[PDB]
Design an enzyme around this catalytic site. Structure first.
Site, PDB file in Angstrom:
ATOM      1  N   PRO A 155       0.815  -1.203  -0.119  1.00  0.00           N
ATOM      2  CA  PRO A 155      -0.046  -0.019  -0.276  1.00  0.00           C
ATOM      3  C   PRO A 155       0.873   1.408   0.112  1.00  0.00           C
ATOM      4  O   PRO A 155       2.024   1.222   0.559  1.00  0.00           O
ATOM      5  CB  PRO A 155      -0.754  -0.114   1.254  1.00  0.00           C
ATOM      6  CG  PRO A 155      -0.071  -0.924   2.102  1.00  0.00           C
ATOM      7  CD  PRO A 155       0.747  -1.928   1.214  1.00  0.00           C
ATOM      8  N   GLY A 156       0.319   2.317  -0.746  1.00  0.00           N
ATOM      9  CA  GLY A 156       1.045   3.623  -0.903  1.00  0.00           C
ATOM     10  C   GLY A 156       1.817   3.626  -1.922  1.00  0.00           C
ATOM     11  O   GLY A 156       2.723   4.881  -2.113  1.00  0.00           O
ATOM     12  N   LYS A 212      -1.455   3.132  -6.396  1.00  0.00           N
ATOM     13  CA  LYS A 212      -2.218   2.103  -7.508  1.00  0.00           C
ATOM     14  C   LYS A 212      -3.348   3.295  -8.045  1.00  0.00           C
ATOM     15  O   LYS A 212      -3.472   3.183  -9.373  1.00  0.00           O
ATOM     16  CB  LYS A 212      -2.792   1.298  -6.691  1.00  0.00           C
ATOM     17  CG  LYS A 212      -1.521   0.178  -6.169  1.00  0.00           C
ATOM     18  CD  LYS A 212      -2.324  -0.883  -5.212  1.00  0.00           C
ATOM     19  CE  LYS A 212      -1.121  -2.188  -5.079  1.00  0.00           C
ATOM     20  NZ  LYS A 212      -0.949  -2.583  -6.160  1.00  0.00           N
ATOM     21  N   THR A 213      -3.892   4.024  -7.390  1.00  0.00           N
ATOM     22  CA  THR A 213      -5.040   4.858  -7.769  1.00  0.00           C
ATOM     23  C   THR A 213      -4.556   5.902  -8.552  1.00  0.00           C
ATOM     24  O   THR A 213      -4.963   6.308  -9.829  1.00  0.00           O
ATOM     25  CB  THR A 213      -5.587   5.579  -6.706  1.00  0.00           C
ATOM     26  OG1 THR A 213      -5.089   6.773  -6.121  1.00  0.00           O
ATOM     27  CG2 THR A 213      -5.918   4.715  -5.235  1.00  0.00           C
ATOM     28  N   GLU A 272      25.788   1.685  25.138  1.00  0.00           N
ATOM     29  CA  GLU A 272      26.006   1.974  23.469  1.00  0.00           C
ATOM     30  C   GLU A 272      27.454   1.802  22.789  1.00  0.00           C
ATOM     31  O   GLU A 272      27.822   1.404  21.956  1.00  0.00           O
ATOM     32  CB  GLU A 272      25.547   3.498  23.218  1.00  0.00           C
ATOM     33  CG  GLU A 272      24.104   3.661  23.046  1.00  0.00           C
ATOM     34  CD  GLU A 272      23.378   2.320  22.465  1.00  0.00           C
ATOM     35  OE1 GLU A 272      23.485   2.069  21.389  1.00  0.00           O
ATOM     36  OE2 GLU A 272      22.816   1.833  23.336  1.00  0.00           O
TER      37      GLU A 272
END
Lengths: 478, 50
Positions: A54-55, A58-59, A274
């Site tokens: 998605p994103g 497609k449209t 770290e």
């Protein structure tokens, strides 16, 4: 009703197409050069299905191909077809295909078929009956009886596995095109085409920006553009530069940077963790390239983080060596051992309780993944003794990795101290200064030979022993 | 015809732009695996699958 006005999207307005654009202009040819297609005895493929994350637009792709085709565009939501009553949906799709038929030439778009394209017999309810009725009605409108050659349907699904085998049957949905996540060049093109609408500088190298936002969808690139529009009032500068987009990518990748009250020993503990993580990460080829190392707290992660980008091709194909995993567990055993080397075994903290679980999960997965060499892989057995013995190898590998991490950590105590002082003093360290301190205070790190050197030495050894066999046959025979 | 049959039997699944620099350590492993399969197939022949 289901018709839209003002369609002007073309292939120029969409970015990151690639050879898919070629297929796209094939559709344009299917709408323009169709007489030559028909004269060569070829039926027009009425079914194309765009599948991807998605994103990806497609449209937008459907709008672009409709605008380039020059025909009427229909875009309809599939959720409207599903109704608590049965019968209206079949009439809606019948009227939809009818108004598409009379508006020929035209192309229609139906998005998210996963609501209406499910298998017949996965849910027992009236909604499932309505879904089956609508699916059969669209099945019979698409191929059922003769009389449609000019209407083409366009489908956009995220999960193609739910598609009915009846629909993907040849003649209904034959063309399947995958639109993937954008790589490198697609990200450049999408960022530039979304950035045309904003005043922008000439020194803006988007290469580093896209090198930060690896593996992100085009909608996320639009979001990166969207965090490059407002946030500059706090400083009040002139023009959009590189560092602003870099910081926007950092924000959308991790979260907002917030500062809270803190003590000094807390900062020392976080920076020690770290430091252990980065120091062990340096000495291995699997994560050698280190870019950032910070201890600043963020949204959802009070602890610090490190950034590494080795080439993302081996992970997708799955070609990771056993030595690639056994090192990583050692890296995940970097914090706790440092605690044992700094505060004693009687004062172990609880900050490494997450990475230590990752190490044990990775050890178990490597044991039961066929990479173990106990018998020969063989992560499955029948009798109880071997199944019980499977878990012991995970503990042995965990202990061996922990001892290796302890030895590596004790080898670099001076680099430990220097980088932890710099971490508490600066709260953020880049690649250049960190690698400079590694060069100043590092020990010997003998890299194991790669596949090519082993191949060459084995090849020369094989050639020499086979020619040894050659003389030991020849001068014994001659 | 060969390409139509190839696309209709669904060999492609990624559907992405096929332009990727393959490392030498990948081609080497692939070639060694294929050579091993070829040697074991020639040494132990199957009567129906050459």
């Amino acid at each position: 009703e289901y018709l839209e006005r003002g369609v002007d999207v073309k292939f120029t307005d969409v970015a990151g197409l690639g050879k898919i654009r070629l297929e796209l202009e094939e559709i344009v040819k299917f709408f323009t050069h169709g007489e030559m297609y028909r004269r060569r005895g070829v039926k027009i493929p009425g079914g194309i299905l765009l599948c991807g994350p998605p994103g990806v637009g497609k449209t937008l792709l459907a709008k672009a191909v409709a605008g380039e085709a020059g025909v009427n565009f229909f875009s309809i939501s599939a959720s409207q077809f599903v109704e608590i009553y049965v019968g209206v949906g079949a009439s809606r799709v019948r009227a939809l295909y009818q108004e598409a038929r009379e508006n020929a030439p035209s192309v229609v778009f139906i998005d998210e078929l996963d609501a209406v394209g499910r298998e017949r017999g996965l849910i027992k309810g009236s909604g499932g009956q309505e879904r089956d009725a609508t699916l059969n009605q669209l099945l019979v409108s698409l191929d059922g009886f003769e009389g449609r050659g000019e209407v083409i349907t366009i489908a956009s699904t995220n999960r193609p596995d739910i598609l009915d085998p009846a629909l993907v049957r040849p003649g209904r949905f034959d063309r399947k095109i995958f639109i993937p996540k954008p790589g490198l060049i697609g990200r450049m093109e999408i960022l530039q085409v979304h950035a045309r609408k904003k005043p922008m500088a000439e020194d803006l190298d988007y290469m580093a920006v896209a090198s930060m936002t690896d593996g992100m969808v085009g909608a996320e690139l639009a979001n990166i553009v969207e965090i490059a529009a407002i946030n500059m009032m706090r400083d009040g500068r002139t023009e959009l530069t590189t560092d602003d987009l870099l910081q926007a990518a950092q924000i959308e990748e991790r979260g907002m940077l917030d500062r809270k009250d803190r003590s000094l020993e807390t900062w020392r503990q976080v920076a020690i963790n770290e430091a252990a993580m980065a120091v062990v990460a340096v000495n291995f080829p699997d994560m050698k390239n280190i870019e950032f190392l910070t201890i600043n707290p963020r949204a959802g992660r009070e602890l610090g983080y490190v950034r590494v980008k080795m080439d993302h091709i081996k992970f997708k194909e799955g070609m990771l060596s056993r030595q690639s995993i056994l090192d990583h567990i050692t890296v995940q055993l970097a914090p706790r051992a440092a605690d044992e080397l700094w505060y004693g075994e009687d004062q172990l903290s609880t900050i490494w309780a997450e990475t230590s679980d990752n190490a044990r999960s990775a050890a178990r997965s490597l044991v039961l993944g066929g990479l173990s060499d106990k018998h020969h892989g063989l992560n499955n057995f029948w009798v109880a003794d071997r199944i019980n013995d499977i878990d012991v190898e995970a503990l042995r590998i965990l202990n061996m990795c922990y001892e290796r991490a302890k030895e590596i950590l004790g080898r670099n105590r001076t680099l430990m101290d220097e980088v932890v002082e710099k971490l508490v003093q600066k709260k953020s360290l880049t690649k250049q200064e960190f690698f400079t301190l590694v060069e100043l205070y590092g020990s010997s790190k003998p890299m194991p030979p790669s596949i090519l050197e082993l191949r060459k030495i084995k090849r020369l050894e094989l050639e020499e022993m086979v020619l040894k066999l050659d003389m030991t046959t020849a001068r014994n025979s001659s | 015809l060969l390409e139509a049959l190839k696309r209709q039997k669904g060999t492609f699944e990624t559907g992405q732009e096929d332009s990727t620099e393959v490392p030498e350590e990948l081609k080497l492993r692939l070639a060694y695996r294929e050579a091993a399969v070829a040697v074991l197939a020639c040494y132990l022949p199957d009567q129906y699958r050459p």
